Amino acid sequence: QQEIQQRTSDMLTAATQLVQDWKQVETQVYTEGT
Amino acid sequence: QQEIQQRTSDMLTAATQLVQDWKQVETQVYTEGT
Amino acid sequence: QQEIQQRTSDMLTAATQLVQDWKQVETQVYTEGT
Amino acid sequence: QQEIQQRTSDMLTAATQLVQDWKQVETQVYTEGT
Amino acid sequence: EVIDKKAFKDMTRNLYPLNPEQVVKLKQIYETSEYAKAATPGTPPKPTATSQFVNLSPGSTPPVIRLSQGFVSSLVFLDSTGAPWPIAAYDLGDPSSFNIQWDKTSNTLMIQATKLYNYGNLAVRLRGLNTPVMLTLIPGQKAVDYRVDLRVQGYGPNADLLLHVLEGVPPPGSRRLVVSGGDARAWLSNEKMYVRTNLTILSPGWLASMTSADGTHAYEMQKSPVLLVSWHGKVMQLKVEG
Amino acid sequence: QFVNLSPGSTPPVIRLSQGFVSSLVFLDSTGAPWPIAAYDLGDPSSFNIQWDKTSNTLMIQATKLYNYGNLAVRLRGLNTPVMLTLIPGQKAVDYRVDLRVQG
Amino acid sequence: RIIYYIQAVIPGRAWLIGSNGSTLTVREGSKIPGYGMVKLIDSLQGRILTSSGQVIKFSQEDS
Amino acid sequence: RIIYYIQAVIPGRAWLIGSNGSTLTVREGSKIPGYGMVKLIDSLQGRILTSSGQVIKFSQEDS
Amino acid sequence: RIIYYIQAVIPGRAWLIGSNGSTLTVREGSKIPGYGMVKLIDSLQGRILTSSGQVIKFSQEDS
Amino acid sequence: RIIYYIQAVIPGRAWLIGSNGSTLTVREGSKIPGYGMVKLIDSLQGRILTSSGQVIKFSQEDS
């Protein structure tokens, strides 16, 4: 049952990545013309 | 029986993170237009 | 038995921090507009 | 008996701090405006 | 093949070590500690504002001012006629314990004390007076002076109720009355009662009347238990009692 | 609420919400706006007071959670100061305080 | 009878509003006109105890 | 009988205001007319003993 | 009668707009004519319980 | 009978365009007049079931 850490290690950074990508919210912009 | 401290340690760093968030609060912004 | 000394130490540190917060008092501000 | 010198030292430190406070006396100030 | 499922579950546990219920209760004890560290020392003082007529006698006692911890006290100088009288000069003992924001030509002073139980004195010189004025002040009482109106025995260089009852301020020493079928607030103070409503009275005749900008009616009236009121073609009788 | 300027009158109080705008306005007997001349505040860290220098409204937020404060305002036509006090953290946030004055 | 509503409540002091509009403040040891002796003031839960057997609370519109 | 209330109070000195607007400051051993002497002047809790046994405190309204 | 739709829902308060046009905001303990006493408020799922048992919800077409 | 076509389909929300020219965005649980009730939403393959057994899709030659 020593294989648990191996699936733990493979998934962890992938788990840690998309949260910041989910935290990636960007501002609105506004443009005019003349 | 000794799994408390490792459960405690990361919980404190998690607790230290959130206690910063509720502590700080930014100001307002007053706008004037013409 | 040393937990008494430990709790005394960190309670002392927290108490010093909060009484440092207690002794702060700032000054008034006056604003004049025309 | 052997703890007297320990109980003297904390009694020494704050009292030495204490004698500065009643030594501190500031000066009179004056404001003139028309 | 459920090894990945167990790994996903326990890595969710390791990613988020806190229960959401624990998050809620940690927030609860957080603001509880905030309330504890924002608690008040003892019972709070009573906020009071006072007026006082000062004494220029060479044997009288100078007045004593209660000082609040950090809260501004406004001390306003007026003469015998109550006209404004700005101060030529001012000086305070122990400048660290108190704050001053003094406008250049006002007859007012704003004072913010800093230390908890240390008392001091203040001396001013008036603009139209040779005589200087000295007060004393102690902090940390159970009554805190928001505004002290000081009046000078000497003379300075310089020497209504209908509005109040239309705005909604009853006269002092007045009581309410019971009116049958009428939307009138009635105050009886000095045997000439004041009536506040939206109606136009018809029978006894107004002695003094005010009609507002919004359109309410205030009348003065002698004591009589029966009135006749006309309202837009309707006629009725009102009983006023107590 | 009406502001009573009697010497023994009880000063007004304002319930506050942290991080939220409190709208303090001043009104006279006719209902005209009375412009604000000058003001003074102790403990400026707890309260941010945006104020246009010729306006008559105050849009103030409170920084702390359970720290009551006071406020002083002197008007254009009045030699008498107006003092108020405010307390944060209540069960009803005063979204608007219309201070009706006597004069 | 004049009914008061809780407006401002701190530890120690409390503020009520009279039925005629006369708002006021009170503490633990004081005499309330129209209700007698002020029994207890709680900073939490919005409860004021009286010697008249009355627990003054917030208004329903003020809550 | 002019009634005195406490206007100001420190350890040692005390300040009293009577009914007519007169005010004065009292030490421990002092002559107060109508009341005699002062036995205790408790700076805490706003309580003052008199030689007649009378307990001088603040006003109820001005407390 | 007069029909209320939820517009703002949070844990602790709820904003309800009547079919008459006016609106109100409520807590757990508040009295609403036409429904009685609020029993429970659920922040998710749009569920608010009454003394009459009627579940206050969003509008059916407006959700 | 107005023929409804699928305009935009995501999990949660659905945009269905009728043959009358009007389209509607609806949630999962909503009663469609003239077709009945949509019980499930399948984002794959653009299939929407109704309570009267019919299936809303895109157009055969306009999709």
Automatic annotation (TrEMBL), chains A, B, C, D:
It comes from the Bacteria. It is found in: Membrane. Belongs to the TrbI/VirB10 family. This is IcmE protein. The gene is icmE.
Automatic annotation (TrEMBL), chains G, H, I, J:
It comes from the Bacteria. This is DotF. The gene is dotF. The chain holds residues 207 to 269 of 269 of the full protein.
